Amino acid sequence: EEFLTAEEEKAIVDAIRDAEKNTSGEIRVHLEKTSEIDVFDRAMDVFHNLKMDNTKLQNGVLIYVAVEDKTFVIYGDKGINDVVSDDFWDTTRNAIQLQFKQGNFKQGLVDGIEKAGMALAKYFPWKKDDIDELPNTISKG
Ligand SMILES: [Ca+2]
Ligand SMILES: [Ca+2]
């Protein structure tokens, strides 16, 4: 609950809104204290439980963070995985890690969100009648 201040949370939600003007992809952040040994499986469960599969193009992506460990997973839906190459999320991960290793938690998420919108834009361009399919709220567990 104290992971982020209200001002930091506002900056993150504003970064999602800006990223979603560059792509039809949908982005959410989920924060929790501790993860499971298989972090990918935990992020997949959270993605499901947040109903992030409810996008026309199956292009939702969850940035899952385990705050006590400062570890994270970028989990994209099937629409993304069917078209992108193996290095797709590298710039997003690097942008988050660069800031997390310096203790800049808010900035890591903002920078990752911005990078993710630009990466998704390559395969999922924003369209005039875009729908905001998933809430931009930070999910807390
Ligand atoms: Ca949208
Ligand atoms: Ca959204």
UniProtKB/TrEMBL annotation:
Record: residues binding Ca(2+) 1: E20, E26, D132, L134, N136
Pfam families xref list: TPM_phosphatase
GO molecular function, one term: metal ion binding
TPM domain span: 1-117
Gene3D superfamilies hit by this protein: 3.10.310.50
Keyword Transmembrane helix: no
Classification via InterPro entries: TPM_dom (IPR007621)
Binding site for Ca(2+) 2: E26, D130, I131
Name assigned to this protein: TPM domain-containing protein
